[PDB]
Amino acid sequence: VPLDGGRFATSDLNDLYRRVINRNNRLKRLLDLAAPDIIVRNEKRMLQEAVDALLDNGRRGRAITGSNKRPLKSLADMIKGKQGRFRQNLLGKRVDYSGRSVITVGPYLRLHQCGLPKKMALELFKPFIYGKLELRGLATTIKAAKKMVEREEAVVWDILDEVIREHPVLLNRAPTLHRLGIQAFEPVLIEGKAIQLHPLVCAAYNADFDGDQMAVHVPLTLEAQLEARALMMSTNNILSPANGEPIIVPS
Amino acid sequence: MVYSYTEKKRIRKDFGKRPQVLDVPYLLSIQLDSFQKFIEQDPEGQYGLEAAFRSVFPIQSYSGNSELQYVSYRLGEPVFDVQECQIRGVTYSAPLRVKLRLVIYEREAPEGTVKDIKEQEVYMGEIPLMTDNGTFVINGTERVIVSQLHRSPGVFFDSDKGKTHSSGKVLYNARIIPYRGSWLDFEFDPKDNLFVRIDRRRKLPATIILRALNYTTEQILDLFFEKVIFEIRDNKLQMELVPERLRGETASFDIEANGKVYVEKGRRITARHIRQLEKDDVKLIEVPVEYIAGKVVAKDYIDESTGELICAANMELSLDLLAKLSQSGHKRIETLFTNDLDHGPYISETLRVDPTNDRLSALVEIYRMMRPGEPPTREAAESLFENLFFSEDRYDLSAVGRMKFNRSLLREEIEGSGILSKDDIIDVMKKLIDIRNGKGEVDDIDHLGNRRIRSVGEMAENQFRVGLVRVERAVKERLSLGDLDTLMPQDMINAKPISAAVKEFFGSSQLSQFMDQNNPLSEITHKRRISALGPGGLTRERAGFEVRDVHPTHYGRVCPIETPEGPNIGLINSLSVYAQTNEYGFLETPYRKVTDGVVTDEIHYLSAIEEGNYVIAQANSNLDEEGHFVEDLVTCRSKGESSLFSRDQVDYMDVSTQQVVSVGASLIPFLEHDDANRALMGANMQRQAVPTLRADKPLVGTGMERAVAVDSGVTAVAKRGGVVQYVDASRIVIKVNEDEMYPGEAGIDIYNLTKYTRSNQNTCINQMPCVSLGEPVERGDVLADGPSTDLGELALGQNMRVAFMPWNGYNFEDSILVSERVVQEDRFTTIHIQELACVSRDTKLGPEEITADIPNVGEAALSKLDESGIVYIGAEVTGGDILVGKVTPKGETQLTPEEKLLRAIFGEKASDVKDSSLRVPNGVSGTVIDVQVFTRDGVEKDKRALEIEEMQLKQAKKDLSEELQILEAGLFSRIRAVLVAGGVEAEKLDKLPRDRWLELGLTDEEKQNQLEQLAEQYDELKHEFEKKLEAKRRKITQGDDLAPGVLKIVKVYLAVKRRIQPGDKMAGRHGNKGVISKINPIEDMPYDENGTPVDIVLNPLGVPSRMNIGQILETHLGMAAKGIGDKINAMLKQQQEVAKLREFIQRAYDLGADVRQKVDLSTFSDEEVMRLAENLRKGMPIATPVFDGAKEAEIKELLKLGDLPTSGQIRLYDGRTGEQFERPVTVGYMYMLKLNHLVDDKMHARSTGSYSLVTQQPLGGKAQFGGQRFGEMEVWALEAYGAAYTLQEMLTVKSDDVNGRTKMYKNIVDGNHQMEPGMPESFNVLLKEIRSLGINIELED
Amino acid sequence: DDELPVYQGETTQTLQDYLMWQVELTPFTDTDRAIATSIVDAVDDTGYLTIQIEDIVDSIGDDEIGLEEVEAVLKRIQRFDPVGVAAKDLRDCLLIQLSQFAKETPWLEEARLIISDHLDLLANHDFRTLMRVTRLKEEVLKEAVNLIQSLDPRPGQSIQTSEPEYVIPDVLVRKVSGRWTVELNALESRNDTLLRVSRCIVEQQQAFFEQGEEYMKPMVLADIAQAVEMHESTISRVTTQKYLHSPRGIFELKYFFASSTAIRALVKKLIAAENPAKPLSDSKLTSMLSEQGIMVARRTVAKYRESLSIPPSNQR
Amino acid sequence: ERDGLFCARIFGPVKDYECLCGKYKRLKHRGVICEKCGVEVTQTKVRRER
DNA sequence: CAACAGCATGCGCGCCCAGGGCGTGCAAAAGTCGTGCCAGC
DNA sequence: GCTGGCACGACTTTTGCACTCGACTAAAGGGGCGCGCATGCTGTTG
């Protein structure tokens, strides 16, 4: 945890190790000194307190510090948290090739499609574009490609269309309650900053247009694209896999 | 009433029937009056600094015979103005100085004092002052401090609602709450025993705390119970009668009263046999012996011969005892009563559970109880006992605590000491037992009687007292054997704890927050807000659902509508309009006084406890010229209720209808027709609107807008008014009337308007002058409009011609389709100014310099910079253009041929310096509106740093020169006047300036008097004015207070206009919101038969389900509002005479039933009427107050005058097909807002960016380029689809698999689209973190 | 722990990180990727230096793999993002940066290849005789040299050193009557008391060394160790950790505890008029110092004036 | 600091194949150890394992 | 007067952000300034 | 023959190294709740 002006400050977990080391060295020093059983006794006490405080700051009372206190955190607290390395590694990675914008209505644009804001793809699809650029021969090297999409002129928008064609994207909203809450679509590039969502699916998403926001994600690979076509496209599932009765119903 | 001046530029039309009595107050006032009472000299000593001085002083040291005292405080004047202080980034405050007398006395000499000495002032800290508007500027930020509403000190009671024991009971517990100190809470057991808790401690017996009071068990029971009596002499056994003390019992034998049986065995216990023995005089009578066996001895009874052993107290008597007490010769025996109906045998079982009733054992029990381990030292007991409550300052409940403690126990005296006493706690236990007995009820914590507000006065005083005690525990050490240096009130006081405590409070604190600076009405509503959170209480998530609810006492105190809709709901409230606060901190609200059945115009402020006793009528009710109610049965409120009462019963009345509603909601037209929740949104949405380039007055409104604007203090208001001498965009001077003036100052008043200025929410603040030139102004008229203000009205959005009808699905759900017109005409275009700062500082490797020139940088990039290196004011800057450049030197490059070769070829190009500069953040844009450049003293800045020096100097010189031109003109008028009497040269005197070198001597009288006065005043004003310019000049050329590790400082401002797109998030007052779905071309819209297309098209289907009908009535009255302005438009455009125009406006204003606005013309004549009419050319601004608003009937009436159809629907035509829509359509002006949510701020998108060192996942958010949490529910949904590859690339390759992210992206660039998944980092981490406990977890193949 | 912005990291990219990213994406064989990874670590934050080539070749442990293979690969690496990258000697740096001028640059291509390829060692001073070597005259050569001087050097565009590493000061020296007065601006308590005593020793240093005088009056750690009776290493440790702040010439004061510094000030005064003679005469200055009473005799005091990147020796 | 938290030797180096003590600086060796310290080179991702 | 079964009180789970905030000697070994010697121009 | 760089010496600077417990007087918080499991004291069965 490096500071604003330099001169690194100690993290939370380090304090526990520093403390244990101090009491370990002091108990060793008084132990090798051949001294009375009272004071080395209190050192045994103090060190069990120290190691037990480095493994769990609970177990008994106070723990913390004079730092503004708070229980601090320990190696136990490094896990089992509402949000932690376990939570981060569990269904919960924060993620890549993603973005998010506001929703508007889609009132042409057939069911399996999705108005995706022009500016916003071009990012999501970067790797893909550079590939095409190197194929056509417009860039011999990666830096060239890179520079032309940075300059974002001309051929690049033309190639973007070619990249996006038939490549299914997937949109996701908010509390995802049921599996419908994420679905997959064929994008259609549209100048704008917002995502146009066809009406009929507004049901499923439980979304109105009062400033709701959608995330967007890009399947890569092949397997993933096919799982998007043959599973999550909105035209596969029109019926609610609870009651069984149609969703998609016009409102 | 002829109004005033700017008001006569546009008068709104009032539809409100009920007359007004009490004017709306200052609104902000609740901030000022607080802090105005915190900075005062008070003789009584309380109320502000005086109280923290008297909270300690004088100090006694340790047996020093010498002490220290203090006398008042006073202040300094603040070094900077509010605008300077805001620019520079300095906190705005002022010095606090105090004169402390020192008294030094001799040792061993009683009352003798050798000497006394005092410093003139000691300087301790700087207390931040408050601006006029309610904010504290702190490090050049506004920061409003929020009022807090906390559980009040005093005595409280609780039933627990018997939701614990599962059997159910009534468990009555009483807590005492001081201002500062420990808490005592007496409770009941399931087995019915009182317990004492101290600071949430495990239960203790009841009689120990009482045992600490030096009361023996005899005094305990005799004091806390009945006395009665019992007497047995030679087996006579006559006991005192107590018929009134018992409402029932079972009689085991015939009771004979004076040789006659009053009640037979098993006879009726009813009041017949009671009064039968009452009316008849009866003395002590004999009773059966078997009845005494259940009674318990009270006082300790011992034989005359032997006082040994048995029967001390709390022992049921036995047949063995009767012989002993009868043989002892004791005639009278005092025993407890204890007959259980209301009464109960409590406090005796507490003695049964009490291990020992001795005092010392109780003190040791509690002393050892406080801290878990403790030796029985006996000193801890004497210390904690006197300390935890009866110390002078340790436990203080103060004045609210003492007062409510007196009224809680029904004591007559409202004054007392701030510390408890024996009889205090004893009486609290008495009332507590009394509640159990059935007599008396509990208190509602939700009641506003029980909840008090603290404001910034009281809180600053708290922290200042804290800070002062931490000084006094130190200064106490100077006389402690610190001996004598004399000179005590200089070195002894350390100002650091005081200052760090005060600026710690205002700086950082839950209740000091950055002010909401978008909207005036956001400002306002921030500065009257009552929060339950903070320091004083309500930690939230644990609060519960009962402090959320509207209680019936919030009636005209808080508001039931304005509240955050978020997960702090009912927690953060807003003061109601006419609400105020007492000296005791309680909310009180006004009422008109009704004597007989006439309503007197005297008003009384009632507190919530005071209010329930009385009867109060309804805000909206009928009435007569005489003042009697029309209807004989009037709906009123009594206590927690409402119902009809007679004319003669009700003594009060509500003043105006605005009382229940807060200012926020007091703005919303037709709020009746709206549902309360939906009203609740829209009140919140008018805050988060955003002021646009040109401010349009709302066309339908409540009348409230003048107050808010001018109160909010965003407008420039004229003091002491008169005719306008000079006008301009940035500046406005008023030549004041001769009437209002301070003699000898003379002169005029100047107003410098603030041009484009970031706000805390990075929006413009801009003032633009309302007044003309050569125009008279009175005090209170607005000279400028702040942003989102028009001629003194609050104008947060724009008016838009709305059509309700579905249109091709573009308005679907809650979305919103708009004509391209709107975008061309630039309404809804809003400015945004953003700050960026560059600072140039001293490193280990030596100093850093700014610009001219840089290594490794093109001329291309440097073309927009200056000689000094800052960008020219005016430049258009995008992307990573260099706003200021700067060089950082590296270490010691010496020798070898290549180093000497690069130094030779390129001239080293300044060598070790690096590229460090102020480049613009990528994806930001805009022109550079201003550059500041604060420097260091003695840096020899030169270059262009001096341009702001000369600029501010010319502005100051030009501003001061005006007073010299006017005063020199007056002196020239006196000199020109005196020369007329004699030696008048006429024109020759005018053509010869500079006194005409005194014009010789003239007469001797004119010589001495005219030369002495003219030359004296002339030289004094010249030398004084030049002296002001020299002092200001010395203030200009200098450099600021600053960190040791910073050399010179530069800041740049940028501005962008942002234009509405389909990400608008537009709303209306009525809880209406949407996005912009599409912008249509003009020909594609629906248009009326005259070809005028609607501006903006909205979806009827909103309106029934949501039940907000303000919308619809707004549209209709809006329609009718434009209509009149269309009549007048068309009329002035045809060059009609003034008379006819006067006739139609007069005829417009006067329409409606009642409506209480009597304005008529003929009072103001010729122009003034043409003025206003041209002012209302664009629509007539009709104003409908909250619950007395305009009826439909009046709207149709108004609307028929405009030759519009009564129904408010009109034929419209399709714009594409040209075909008429079937069915008419509502078209109408509705008044829209644009909310602070814009998609420019929202749209993100990343592909591959920076990660986190641990876990190696992408970063959190936009700006930092998050990627986008793919959370546990989102995985569940994929699993549910059974798509495991998509799920598998989410988890790995595209988050924490490092080798696999690379392989992935390289194959993608090559067109492989294949995964090669690995193992995500974060699992590896986990395995190390579990290995860090003594557990191995390893992966076995 | 998590759910908060702990200082987990940023994962920034340096130049070697970025070059390696650029290698990942180019059509190298299995071996050539090993040579590439072998070269990109050899590169420095300064660009140009790829250090020794034959150690790059020999580092692979023979078995074939000639010099030419590392040479070609090396060129291609030298061609990646920041234009001229690596190479060696600056000459080949400017030849690679000059490799792409678009060839449509008038007069620049040829002339620039002659000047930059060979004879550039004599271009340091000025043109002079070189004008007769290439037969060029007037502004034809001067414009080419304008291009050569317009090139810049290596990389140091990747950088990734946004951290200026500021000083933060420690103790402020408010300047009094042409001197300095301490104020200290800006167990654990025992350590704080020790830091206060170090500030007191700096105040004693104010008494130990004259501020107004050239450089600083010579002092020994035995003076500060005499005042408070503290050990030398302790005082030097306090002054080594913390850095004293003064209105003029603020410094850790570690160098403040008039000796060689006065000689350096005298050397600076000599440097001001030293411009007339490129070779310089610290030995002659040493004779002047001996005449002044310093008794310097071509000593390192003069040599220090003749060192410290002085025109002395380097001009010779 | 040597034999401390954070320390070189155990826990590995600080710069990638460059190590403290200023010797065997790069890639000359897959492994090696200085004479001043126990610094074992090989990459520095090893602060995440050791 | 024995062990056995039940009622009750206390303690630890959950939910959920929440915000940051941060001297005391003496003594053996070594860094550096001074002075002299040797090599380059 | 003169200047600059470096080597050798002295000095004066750097560095060894740590235990007692030191403590110290308050500093405050503070309106959810269920649910369950275990320990402990009481109580009734024989």
Q: Are residues B1064 and B1210 in the same domain?
A: yes
> Which of A198, A217, A207 lies closest to A120 in space, CA to CA?
A217
3-state secondary structure of B296: strand
CB of B1175 within 8 A of CB of B10? yes
Q: Are residues B721 and B849 in the same domain?
A: no
| Nearest residue, CB atoms, C168 vs list A7, A83, A87 | A7
CB of B364 within 8 A of CB of B260? no
Contact (CB<8Å) A103/B1075: yes
CB of B1 within 8 A of CB of B1163? no
Query: In Å, how far from its chain's centre is CA B369?
Result: 42
Q: Per the structure, how many domains does chain B have?
A: 9
Q: How far is B1274 from chain C (nearest CA, A)?
A: 18
CB of B324 within 8 A of CB of B303? yes
Cβ-count burial C126-151 (b if 16+ within 10 Å, e if not): ebeebeeebebeeeebeebbebbeeb
A contact residues 21-80, partner C, Cβ 8 Å cutoff: 73, 77-78
- Assigned token pair, B411: 């004591």
User: Omega of the bond prior to A246 within 30 degrees of 0, cis?
Assistant: no
For residue B1179, give the amino acid letter.
G
H-helix or E-strand containing B717? strand B716-717
> Which of C132, C90, B904 lies closest to C141 in space, CA to CA?
C132
Cβ-count burial B1192-1215 (b if 16+ within 10 Å, e if not): eebbbbbbeebebeeebbbebbeb
Q: Please name the chains neighbouring A, where neighbouring means 3+ C-beta pairs under 8 angstroms.
A: B, C, D
List protein-proximal bases of chain E (any atom < 7 A from a CB): 9-10, 12-27, 32-38, 41
> Which of C82, A126, A119 lies closest to B856 in space, CA to CA?
C82
3-state secondary structure of A185: strand
CATH number at residue B619: 2.30.150.10
CB of B1036 within 8 A of CB of B829? no
List protein-proximal bases of chain F (any atom < 7 A from a CB): 2-7, 11-22, 25-34
Q: Decide if B968 is inside a domain.
A: yes
CA separation for the pair A126, A160 (Å, rounded): 9
Domain stop point among B398, B413, B444: B444
Q: Are residues B1079 and B1213 in the same domain?
A: yes
Instruction: Name the closest nucleotide to A58, judged by C1' and CA.
Output: E12
Contact (CB<8Å) C12/B844: no
For the beta carbon of residue C22, count every other beta carbon within 10 angstroms: 21
Residues of chain B neighbouring C157 (CB-CB closer than 8 A): 856, 915
Q: Are residues B724 and B868 in the same domain?
A: no
For residue B1068, give the amino acid letter.
G
CB of A125 within 8 A of CB of A102? no
- Sign for the pseudo-dihedral over CA of A139, A141, A145, A148: negative
3-state secondary structure of B860: helix
Measure the CA dihedral B538/B543/B548/B553, to 10°: -60
Contact (CB<8Å) A5/C166: yes
Cβ-count burial A113-152 (b if 16+ within 10 Å, e if not): bbbbbebbbbbbbbbbbbbbbbeeeebebbbebbebbeee
CA separation for the pair B788, B690 (Å, rounded): 8
> Which of B535, B515, B545, B541 lies closest to B527 in space, CA to CA?
B515
Cβ-count burial B499-529 (b if 16+ within 10 Å, e if not): bebbbebbeebebbeebbbbbbbbbbbbbbb
CB of B1092 within 8 A of CB of B1083? no
CB of C224 within 8 A of CB of C257? yes
Output the 3-class SS for B587-648: EEEEEEEEECCEEEEEEEEEEHHHHCCCCECCCCCCCCCCCCCCCCEEEEECCCCEEEEECC
Interface test with A, best of B1278, B1305, B1325, B1330 (most A CBs within 10 A): B1278
Q: Decide if B194 is inside a domain.
A: yes
Report CA Rg, chain D. 10
Instruction: Name the closest nucleotide to B200, judged by C1' and CA.
Output: F30
Crossing angle between the packed helical segments C108-117 and C139-149, to the nearest 10 degrees:
70
DSSP string, A37-75: HHHHHHHHHHHHHHHHHHH-S-SSS----SSS------T
CB of B750 within 8 A of CB of B731? yes
H-helix or E-strand containing B177? strand B173-177
- The residue assigned the tokens 């090696």 is D32
Residues of chain A neighbouring C166 (CB-CB closer than 8 A): 5-6
3-state secondary structure of B1080: strand
Interface test with C, best of A16, A56, A143 (most C CBs within 10 A): A143
> How many residues in total does chain D contain?
50
- Assigned token pair, B713: 């203090």
CATH number at residue B373: 3.90.1110.10
- Assigned token pair, B876: 């258009």
Contact (CB<8Å) A176/B1329: no
Cβ-count burial A220-247 (b if 16+ within 10 Å, e if not): bbebbbebbbebbbbeebeebeeeeeeb
CA separation for the pair A221, A122 (Å, rounded): 18
- Assigned token pair, B802: 């709305």
Query: In Å, how far from its chain's centre is CA B394?
Result: 30
Q: Are residues B631 and B778 in the same domain?
A: no
Q: Decide if B386 is inside a domain.
A: yes
CA separation for the pair B816, A103 (Å, rounded): 12
Provide the CA A65 to C1' F23 distance, Å, integer.
16
Q: How far is B516 from chain A (nearest CA, A)?
A: 21
Q: Are residues B435 and B510 in the same domain?
A: no
Q: Decide if B612 is inside a domain.
A: yes
H-helix or E-strand containing B273? helix B271-279
- Assigned token pair, B567: 């997960």
Q: Are residues B316 and B230 in the same domain?
A: yes
Q: Decide if B16 is inside a domain.
A: no
Q: Decide if B1252 is inside a domain.
A: no
Element counts in chain C: helices (H) and strands (E): 14, 3
CB of C263 within 8 A of CB of C277? no
3-state secondary structure of B825: helix
Measured CA to CA in angstroms, residue B1162 lies from B1143, B1155, B1166, B1168, B1170 at distances of 10, 20, 9, 11, 13
CB of B363 within 8 A of CB of B212? yes
Q: Are residues B1199 and B1119 in the same domain?
A: yes
CB of B870 within 8 A of CB of B837? no
- The residue assigned the tokens 């935890």 is B388
Using DSSP bridges, classify how beta strands B173-177 and B1076-1080 pair: parallel, antiparallel or unpaired.
unpaired
Domain stop point among B310, B343, B376: B343
> Which of B1244, B1245, B1339, B1249 lies closest to B1301 in space, CA to CA?
B1249
Q: Decide if B458 is inside a domain.
A: yes
CATH number at residue B772: 2.40.50.100
Q: Are residues B672 and B805 in the same domain?
A: yes
3-state secondary structure of A137: coil
- Assigned token pair, B716: 């420039």
CA separation for the pair B355, B366 (Å, rounded): 13
CB of B1189 within 8 A of CB of B704? no
CA separation for the pair B604, B614 (Å, rounded): 12
| HSE toward the beta carbon, residue B1293, CA cutoff 13 A | 25
Burial class of residue C125 (count of CB atoms within 10 Å of its CB; 0-12, 13-18, 19+): exposed
Q: Are residues B629 and B661 in the same domain?
A: no
Crossing angle between the packed helical segments A126-136 and A155-164, to the nearest 10 degrees:
110
> Does residue D34 have a known ligand-binding role?
yes
DSSP string, B420-439: --HHHHHHHHHHHHHHHTTS
**Residue numbers of the domain that contains B756:** 714-788
CA nearest A213 in B: which residue?
B1242
| Nearest residue, CB atoms, C1 vs list A7, A77, A143 | A77
- Assigned token pair, D24: 């065997």
**Contacts with B164 (C-beta within 8 Å, 6 or more apart), sequence order:** B171
> Which of B901, B959, B1184, A164 lies closest to C314 in space, CA to CA?
B901
Q: How far is B518 from chain C (nearest CA, A)?
A: 29
CB of B681 within 8 A of CB of B1083? no
Measured CA to CA in angstroms, residue C134 lies from B148, C92, C127, C141, C150 at distances of 86, 20, 10, 9, 21
- The residue assigned the tokens 């340096």 is C14
Interface test with C, best of B913, B936, B1253, B1305 (most C CBs within 10 A): B1253
> Which of A238, A239, A219 lies closest to A227 in space, CA to CA?
A219
CA separation for the pair C62, C65 (Å, rounded): 6
Task: Determine whether the distance from the CB of C217 to the nearest atom of strand F is below 7 Å.
Answer: no
CB of B653 within 8 A of CB of B595? no
> Which of B143, B147, B152 lies closest to B530 in space, CA to CA?
B147
Q: Characterise C22 by phi-psi region: left (phi > 0), alpha (psi -120 to 50), beta (else).
A: alpha
Burial class of residue B49 (count of CB atoms within 10 Å of its CB; 0-12, 13-18, 19+): buried
> Does residue A208 have a known ligand-binding role?
yes
- The residue assigned the tokens 């309009």 is B577
Q: Are residues B1047 and B1194 in the same domain?
A: no
CA separation for the pair B795, B521 (Å, rounded): 10
CB of A12 within 8 A of CB of A1? no
| Nearest residue, CB atoms, B1281 vs list A101, A177, A179 | A179
CATH number at residue B927: 2.40.50.150
**Contacts with A213 (C-beta within 8 Å, 6 or more apart), sequence order:** A100, A101, A102, A103, A173, B1242
Q: Please, which experimental method was used?
A: cryo-EM
- Residue B513, beta-bridge partner list: B144
CA separation for the pair B81, B774 (Å, rounded): 30
- Integer distance in angstroms from the first to the last C-alpha of chain C? 62
**Contacts with B263 (C-beta within 8 Å, 6 or more apart), sequence order:** B251, B254, B255, B269, B273, B277
> Which of C20, A130, C229, A17 lies closest to B1310 in space, CA to CA?
A130
Q: Are residues B413 and B288 in the same domain?
A: no
For residue B603, give the amino acid letter.
I
H-helix or E-strand containing B83? helix B82-88
Measure the CA dihedral B374/B376/B380/B381, to 10°: 120
Residue B846: φ, ψ to 5°: 110, 175
Task: Determine whether the distance from the CB of A64 to the nearest atom of strand F is below 7 Å.
Answer: no
Domain stop point among B1194, B1211, B1242: B1242
Q: Decide if B11 is inside a domain.
A: no
- Sign for the pseudo-dihedral over CA of A32, A36, A37, A39: negative
> Which of B1056, B834, B1047 lies closest to B945 in space, CA to CA?
B1047
CA separation for the pair B1062, B815 (Å, rounded): 10
